[PDB]
Amino acid sequence: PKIHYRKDYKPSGFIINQVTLNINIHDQETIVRSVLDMDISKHNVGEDLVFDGVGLKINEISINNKKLVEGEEYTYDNEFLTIFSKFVPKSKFAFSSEVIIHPETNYALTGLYKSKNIIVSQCEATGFRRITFFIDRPDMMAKYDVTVTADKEKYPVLLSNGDKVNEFEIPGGRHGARFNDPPLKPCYLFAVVAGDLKHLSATYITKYTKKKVELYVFSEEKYVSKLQWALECLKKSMAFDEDYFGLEYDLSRLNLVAVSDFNVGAMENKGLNIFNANSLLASKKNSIDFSYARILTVVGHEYFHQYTGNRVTLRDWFQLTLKEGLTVHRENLFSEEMTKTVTTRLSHVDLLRSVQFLEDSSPLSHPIRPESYVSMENFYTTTVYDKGSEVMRMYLTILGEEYYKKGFDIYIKKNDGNTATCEDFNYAMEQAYKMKKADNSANLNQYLLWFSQSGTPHVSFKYNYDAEKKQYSIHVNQYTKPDENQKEKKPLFIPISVGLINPENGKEMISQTTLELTKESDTFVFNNIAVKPIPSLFRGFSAPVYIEDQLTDEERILLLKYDSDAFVRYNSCTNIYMKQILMNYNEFLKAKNEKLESFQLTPVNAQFIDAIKYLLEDPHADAGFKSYIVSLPQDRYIINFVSNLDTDVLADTKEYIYKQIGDKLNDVYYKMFKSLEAKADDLTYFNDESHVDFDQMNMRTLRNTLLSLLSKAQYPNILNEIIEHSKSPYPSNWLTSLSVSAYFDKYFELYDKTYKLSKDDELLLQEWLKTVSRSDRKDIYEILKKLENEVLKDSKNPNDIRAVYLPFTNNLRRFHDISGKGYKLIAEVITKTDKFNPMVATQLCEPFKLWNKLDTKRQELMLNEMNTMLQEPQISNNLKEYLLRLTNK
C-alpha cells in the first residue's frame, strides 16, 4: 500500500482548466463522457500523464479527438490510467473519455450511487475518480459544465453545481439538464443528484448586498413534511455568518438534499449540500429531541464550509483540519448562540474528553495535521475535527472577540481564491496577535506545535497564599507523554482562563484573566487578594488538556455551588466523581484479587450529595446542567485514568456510587420528575414546525435522566410512571419508557408498543433500534439476534447497521462479557460490512480503540478478534490499515 507523506507535497505537472461532463443514467448502467481541457504546468518534467480512475470500465479514451490504443499508448489497472509521455502534448490539449459505472450496485456509498430511488454522488475525499478519470487532488482547480440525462418519470429532478442553463426532452421518455459552474473548484466539491424529489423553499435576502437567495430543501415525497426545521436552520446559519463574521452567501441558490444511505452526516458540495436523512429531517411526532440540535449543527456546519472549505480551499489533504477544525469551531459558536444553553458547550467538551482523549492515548494517536496516510477515509477523525476545533477556538480565547474577527477577516481576504495551509491561518492570527500586543516582535511560532504534536497535555497546579501579603500564587506545570509520533514533546502555548472565587461569599475576586502558559512551568502571582481564594481554572475549558486541579473535594463542592463558569462547575463535579470512582474501583479490585470474604467501601462524600440536592432544588438553575451533575463521567473518559481496566470492576464501582447517591436523593429525584412534567412536556407548540425550545428539551432530558435513575433503583411503584410515560406524544419520552422498562416484566410489552409506533418512519425505526440495542437487558444477546432476524436482515443501510450494533457496545457489563462473545459478534459484523462498505466497517471498529487499556484477559480477547479480522483474505485497504495501526503492527 502506498504511504503518502506530508513533506512530499509537490504541485502537479499538469493543469485541468475545464471539465465538461455528460452523465447519462440508464436502468442497468451509467455512461460518463468527460472532456478535460488541459495544459502542461511549469513544474512538468516530461512525466507520463497519470489519472486516478477507480473501477471505471473504459469504452474509449482520446487526446485531441484521436482515439488512444490500449497497451501501446496507455495502460489501465483499475486504479490509475497511465498515458505514456511521448503521447502527451506539450501545450494546451483536450483529454476525453467515456466510461461505464454502475450506481445501482455501488454499496460503498462513494462516487456515484443509488440510495433507495435517488442517484447521488459523494466525492470527498477521493470519490470523483470513481465517476471519471481525473487528477483527483484538491489543488487541481477547474471550471465545470455538467449535463445529466435520465428517465423523466423515475428522475424528474436533476441537480448539479452552478446555474441550470438548459433543460431538454430526449426521445424514449428521457430528459436532460445542463449546469454551468464558472467559478473554479476542487473535484471533491462536484455533486450530482437525480430523483423524484419534493421540496420546501424560501427566499433569503442578504444583509449588505441585499442579493436574493433561493433556498431549496429536498427529500423523497414520503418525508417532505420533515424538512421545515432544516429550512429554519439554514436561514439561521446565513444570518449568523453575516452577524458574527460579516460574511454573505455569494450564489443565487442553495440546495439541501436528504438521502437515506450516507456514510457520515452530510457534505458541503458548492450550492448542493447532501445530507444523511438523520441530519436533515425531523418532526415533533416522529423524531427524538436530539434530532433538533443535530440538524441545526449539521446544516450550520455545511453552510459554514461555503467560506471555510469552499471559497478558501485546501492545498492537500494533510490540511484537512484547516477546513474541518475551523468549521466545527464556527458551527459550535453558532450552536451556542442559537441554543442559548450552557449544555451546548458542555456537550462538546464531553465529546472531546471521552472520545478524542481516548483516541489521543491509543495506538491511533495522531496530530491534528498528520505526517502521513494510507487511506484518506481513515483521516476524518475526532482528533482532526474536535481537537482541531479546540485549537481553532484557542485563537479566539487568546485574541478576544475583536482581534479574532480581525485575524479571521485577514485570513478570508488574503486567501479567498485559493488554496491554503495551516500556516496561512496561523500567519493571519499572528497579525492580529501583533496588533493586540501592540508590537510587531510578537509571534505565534510556538502555537504551530498544536498542529504537529500528538497527545493530550497534562496541566497541573500548586498554590500559595500569603495572608499578611494578600498575595496569591498559582504554579502551573505542563507535560505531554511521549508517544510513537514524538520522542521529545515540547511545551505548548496554553491559554488558561481563570477566576478567583472568594469562598466566604462566592464572589469574583479578579477581572477576567487568561494566563498565557508558554513554558514547561510558570508561576503566576496576584497581589491585593484579600482572602485565600478558590481558583476557577480553565473557564469554558480554555485548552484541550487533562486538568489536574489539586483541589480538595470541599473546594470543588464550593466551585460546584458558587462559581460563575458552567464548565468549571461541571468539571469540579466530574473531578469529585473521578476521585470516588478511582477509590471504589481499587477497593473492589483488591477484594476481587485477594478473594476477600468481607471488605469495606468508602462512601460517597456526604457534602457532595448535599451539593447535588441544593442544585437540583434551585429553580433558577439550568435543567440540562442538572442532568450532567446526576450522571457519572463517561466510561471512555474514566478509562484514561485507570491501567488494565477491569470492566466488571468498573461496572460494580458505578453501580455502588449511583446507589449511594440514590439512597439519599431518590425522593428528590421523584419529586422533580413529577414537578417538571408540565413544562417539560408542554404541548402548546407541538404542531408548530418551526418552534424549537432547547430549554424545554433539556427539561425532558432531565426528566428522562431521573426516570432512568429511579427505574434502576426500583423506586416504589415507578412502573406506573414508566407506563404513563410510554403514552407521551414525544419520542424522547416513549423511547425512554422502553429502555427504563428493561428492569421490569413489562419490557417486551413496551418493545412491541414502541415498535408499532416507530415502524412506518425510517428514521424513527432507527431510533427504536438504538434504544433496544442500548437496553440494559440480561437477554440482550438474544434480543440482538431477534433484531437481526426480524428487523435488520441483510440491510446495507449504514444507519440501520450502526443503530443495531454501536449502542450495545456501550453496555459495560455485557459487550465486555469475559467469554469474548461481544467482541466476536462485532468483529463478524465488521467483516461482513467490509465486503460492501469499508468506511462503515472501519466506523464499526470504534469499540476496539481502547483494547490495550483493558485487563490482560480482555486485551487478549480483543486482540484475537482484530488479528482474525486482519487474516480475512478479502479485507479492504481501509480496514487493513486501521487495524494494523490499532494493533501496533
Q: How far apart are CA 222 and CA 767, in angstroms?
A: 18
Q: How far apart are CA 656 and CA 338, in angstroms?
A: 39
Give the cell for residue 627.
442532568
- Is 266 annotated among the ligand-binding residues? yes
Q: How far apart are CA 754 and CA 722, in angstroms?
A: 13
Q: How far apart are CA 473 and CA 577, in angstroms?
A: 27
Shortest approach of Zn ion to residue 304 CB, angstroms?
Answer: 8
Shortest approach of Mg ion to residue 100 CB, angstroms?
Answer: 7
Give the cell for residue 285.
411526532
Say if CB 246 and CB 410 are below 8 A apart. no
Q: Nearer to Zn ion by C-beta: 329 or 774? A: 329
Burial profile 83-112: b = 16 or more Cβ within 10 angstroms, e = fewer: beeeebeeeebbbbbbbebebeebbbbbbb
In the bound complex, which residue of the shown chain has the CB atom lying closest to Mg ion? 55
Q: How far apart are CA 651 and CA 810, in angstroms?
A: 12
Closest by CA to 388, choosing from 368, 373, 408, 362, is: 368
Q: Nearer to Zn ion by C-beta: 381 or 574? A: 381
Shortest approach of Mg ion to residue 171 CB, angstroms?
Answer: 28
Q: How far apart are CA 164 and CA 570, in angstroms?
A: 51
Residue 55, binding choice from Mg ion, Zn ion, none, Cβ under 5 to 8 Å by partner class: Mg ion
Catalytic-role residue among 98, 232, 248, 302: 302
Close Cβ partners of 142 (under 8 Å, ≥ 6 residues apart): 16, 17, 18, 19, 36, 184, 185, 187
> CA–CA distance from 225 to each of 199, 228, 229, 300, 683 (Å)?
9, 7, 10, 20, 19
- Is 265 annotated among the ligand-binding residues? yes
Shortest approach of Zn ion to residue 216 CB, angstroms?
Answer: 21
Say if CB 35 and CB 62 are below 8 A apart. no
Give the phi and the psi of residue 56 in degrees, each rounded to 5. -85, 140
Q: How many CA atoms lie within 13 A of 172 on its CB side?
A: 6
Angle at 350 between CA 446 and CA 565, to 5 degrees: 80
> CA–CA distance from 780 to each of 100, 647, 704, 822 (Å)?
46, 17, 22, 11
- Is 268 annotated among the ligand-binding residues? yes
- Is 301 annotated among the ligand-binding residues? yes
Shortest approach of Mg ion to residue 752 CB, angstroms?
Answer: 38
- Is 587 annotated among the ligand-binding residues? no
DSSP readout, 87-135? Answer: GS-SSSEEEEEEEEE-GGG-TT--EEEEETTEEEEE-TTTTGGGTS-B-
Q: Nearer to Zn ion by C-beta: 176 or 300? A: 300
Shortest approach of Mg ion to residue 802 CB, angstroms?
Answer: 17
Q: Of the ranges 49-57, 110-118, 527-535, 726-734, which one interacts with Mg ion (CB under 5 A)?
A: 49-57
Q: Which of residues 815-844 bind Mg ion (CB under 5 A)?
A: none
Closest by CA to 673, choosing from 622, 629, 725, 598, is: 725
Say if CB 851 and CB 862 are below 8 A apart. yes
Shortest approach of Zn ion to residue 256 CB, angstroms?
Answer: 15
Closest by CA to 671, choosing from 617, 714, 720, is: 617
Closest by CA to 569, choosing from 602, 524, 618, is: 618
What's the one-letter identity of residue 643? S
In the bound complex, which residue of the shown chain has the CB atom lying closest to Zn ion? 327
Shortest approach of Mg ion to residue 518 CB, angstroms?
Answer: 33
The count of other CB atoms within 10 Å of the CB of residue 239 is 15
> CA–CA distance from 504 to each of 369, 498, 532, 555, 621 (Å)?
46, 18, 9, 12, 21
Report the side by side order of strands in the sheet with 74-76: 49-52, 80-83, 74-76
Q: Nearer to Zn ion by C-beta: 306 or 799? A: 306
Q: How many CA atoms lie within 13 A of 581 on its CB side?
A: 24
- Is 331 annotated among the ligand-binding residues? no
Q: For this structure, is 302 an active site residue?
A: yes
Q: Of the ranges 54-62, 127-135, 186-194, 692-700, which one interacts with Mg ion (CB under 5 A)?
A: 54-62
Q: How far apart are CA 54 and CA 128, in angstroms?
A: 9
Shortest approach of Mg ion to residue 852 CB, angstroms?
Answer: 29
Q: Which of residues 169-188 bind Zn ion (CB under 5 A)?
A: none
Q: Which of residues 312-341 bind Zn ion (CB under 5 A)?
A: 327
**Pairs from 511-516 (Cβ < 8 Å, separation ≥ 24):** 514/397, 514/398, 514/542, 515/474, 515/476, 516/398
Q: What is the DSSP letter of 591?
A: H
Q: Binding residues for Zn ion, how many (CB under 5 A)?
A: 1
Q: Of the ranges 53-61, 456-464, 498-506, 542-550, which one interacts with Mg ion (CB under 5 A)?
A: 53-61
Q: Which of residues 790-809 bind Mg ion (CB under 5 A)?
A: none
Shortest approach of Mg ion to residue 55 CB, angstroms?
Answer: 4
Give the phi and the psi of residue 212 in degrees, each rounded to 5. -80, 130
> CA–CA distance from 167 to each of 26, 32, 162, 273 (Å)?
18, 19, 14, 22
- Is 428 annotated among the ligand-binding residues? no
Shortest approach of Mg ion to residue 359 CB, angstroms?
Answer: 18
Strand partners, 472: 465, 526
User: Residues for the chain: how many in total?
Assistant: 889
Interface pick for Mg ion out of 9, 20, 33, 55 (rule CB under 5 A) = 55
Burial profile 651-675: b = 16 or more Cβ within 10 angstroms, e = fewer: bbbbebbbebbbeebbebbbebbee
Q: Which residues are annotated as a binding site?
A: 124, 265-266, 268, 301, 305, 324
Q: Which residues are annotated as a binding site for a peptide?
A: 124, 265-266, 268
Q: Which residues are annotated as a binding site for Zn(2+)?
A: 301, 305, 324
- Which residues are known catalytic residues? 302
Q: Which residues bind Zn ion (CB under 5 A)?
A: 327
Q: Which residues bind Mg ion (CB under 5 A)?
A: 55
